[PDB]
Scaffold this active site. Structure first.
Site, PDB file in Angstrom:
ATOM      1  N   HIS A  46       0.864  -1.235   0.029  1.00  0.00           N
ATOM      2  CA  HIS A  46      -0.080   0.052  -0.038  1.00  0.00           C
ATOM      3  C   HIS A  46       0.886   1.240   0.053  1.00  0.00           C
ATOM      4  CE1 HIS A  46      -1.965  -2.853   3.036  1.00  0.00           C
ATOM      5  NE2 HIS A  46      -2.829  -2.995   1.872  1.00  0.00           N
ATOM      6  N   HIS A  48       1.070   4.567   2.072  1.00  0.00           N
ATOM      7  CA  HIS A  48       0.566   5.263   3.310  1.00  0.00           C
ATOM      8  C   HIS A  48       0.857   6.686   3.318  1.00  0.00           C
ATOM      9  CE1 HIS A  48       0.282   1.337   6.055  1.00  0.00           C
ATOM     10  NE2 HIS A  48       0.575   0.932   4.915  1.00  0.00           N
ATOM     11  N   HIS A  56      -3.146   4.263   6.011  1.00  0.00           N
ATOM     12  CA  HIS A  56      -3.016   4.216   4.396  1.00  0.00           C
ATOM     13  C   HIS A  56      -3.424   5.623   3.761  1.00  0.00           C
ATOM     14  CE1 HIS A  56      -4.212  -0.257   4.434  1.00  0.00           C
ATOM     15  NE2 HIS A  56      -3.127  -0.005   5.034  1.00  0.00           N
ATOM     16  N   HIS A  64     -11.248   0.844   3.694  1.00  0.00           N
ATOM     17  CA  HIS A  64     -10.143   0.158   3.102  1.00  0.00           C
ATOM     18  C   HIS A  64     -10.870  -1.046   2.048  1.00  0.00           C
ATOM     19  CE1 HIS A  64      -6.515  -2.105   2.732  1.00  0.00           C
ATOM     20  NE2 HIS A  64      -7.117  -3.122   2.750  1.00  0.00           N
ATOM     21  N   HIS A  73      -9.297   2.980  -0.248  1.00  0.00           N
ATOM     22  CA  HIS A  73      -8.469   3.946   0.073  1.00  0.00           C
ATOM     23  C   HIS A  73      -7.661   4.352  -1.355  1.00  0.00           C
ATOM     24  CE1 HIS A  73      -8.053   2.390   4.252  1.00  0.00           C
ATOM     25  NE2 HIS A  73      -9.081   3.585   4.181  1.00  0.00           N
ATOM     26  N   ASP A  76      -4.744   1.712  -1.786  1.00  0.00           N
ATOM     27  CA  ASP A  76      -5.029   0.290  -1.659  1.00  0.00           C
ATOM     28  C   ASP A  76      -4.463  -0.276  -2.881  1.00  0.00           C
ATOM     29  OD1 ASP A  76      -5.888   0.596   1.131  1.00  0.00           O
ATOM     30  OD2 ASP A  76      -8.164   0.637   0.503  1.00  0.00           O
ATOM     31  N   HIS A 113       3.883  -5.323   3.832  1.00  0.00           N
ATOM     32  CA  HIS A 113       3.473  -5.831   5.037  1.00  0.00           C
ATOM     33  C   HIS A 113       4.023  -7.338   5.366  1.00  0.00           C
ATOM     34  CE1 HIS A 113       1.006  -2.369   6.381  1.00  0.00           C
ATOM     35  NE2 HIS A 113       0.768  -2.330   5.039  1.00  0.00           N
ATOM     36  N   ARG A 136       5.128  -3.578   9.145  1.00  0.00           N
ATOM     37  CA  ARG A 136       5.790  -3.350   8.143  1.00  0.00           C
ATOM     38  C   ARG A 136       6.989  -4.014   7.958  1.00  0.00           C
ATOM     39  NH1 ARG A 136       3.077   0.478  10.530  1.00  0.00           N
ATOM     40  NH2 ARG A 136       1.507   2.075   9.452  1.00  0.00           N
TER      41      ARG A 136
HETATM   42 CL    CL Z   1       2.265   5.911   7.497  1.00  0.00          CL
HETATM   43 CU    CU Z   2      -0.546  -0.751   4.290  1.00  0.00          CU
HETATM   44 ZN    ZN Z   3      -6.307   0.964   2.888  1.00  0.00          ZN
END
Ligand code: CL
Ligand code: CU
Ligand code: ZN
Ligand code: CL
Length: 146
Positions: A46, A48, A56, A64, A73, A76, A113, A136
């Site tokens: 994603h 962020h 996100h 999401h 988002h 996403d 992630h 993360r």
């Molecule tokens: Cl962040």
């Molecule tokens: Cu993320």
């Molecule tokens: Zn998201």
């Protein structure tokens, strides 16, 4: 065409170079590259909000989702899939992110992630925030290509 690169680094072995390209200021964005140092499986991927554990990138104040969901988002981008030796090939075309304008993803943080994004189809409210993707493994600022 506008081009960007994010160099993913973390505290472990996960690393990679991700490219972005957008031919028209309001055209789709192509995203590609390879991430190494993973393990076999699916991993959330994603944009962020961080520029400077943040959410996100979500300039439109949505919930999401997966990348092809009507509700998602801006950040996403779903999951990347790594094989048994820990390499994921990324090849994504996206219609929601952009490299120009009021909501450009330039300067924001690309993240991979520790676990899979449930695409907002999970059984808790966290699913509608983060896809339950957990911590993360690697991140990198999205910068205009030098
Ligand atoms: Cl962040
Ligand atoms: Cu993320
Ligand atoms: Zn998201
Ligand atoms: Cl976990």
């Amino acid at each position: 065409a506008t081009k960007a690169v994010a160099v993913l680094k973390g505290d472990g072995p996960v690393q990679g170079i991700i490219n972005f390209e957008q031919k028209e200021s309001n055209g789709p964005v192509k995203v590609w590259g390879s991430i190494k140092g993973l393990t076999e499986g699916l991993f959330g991927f994603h944009v962020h909000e961080e520029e400077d554990a943040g959410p996100h990138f979500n300039p439109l104040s949505r919930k999401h989702g997966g990348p092809k969901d009507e509700e998602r988002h801006v950040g996403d981008l779903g999951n990347v899939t790594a094989d048994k030796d820990g390499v994921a090939d990324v090849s994504i075309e996206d219609s929601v992110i952009s490299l120009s304008g009021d909501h450009a993803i330039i300067g924001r943080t690309l993240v991979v992630h520790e676990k899979a994004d449930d695409l907002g189809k999970g059984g808790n409210e966290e699913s509608t925030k983060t896809g339950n993707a957990g911590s993360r493994l690697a991140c990198g600022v999205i910068g205009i290509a030098q």
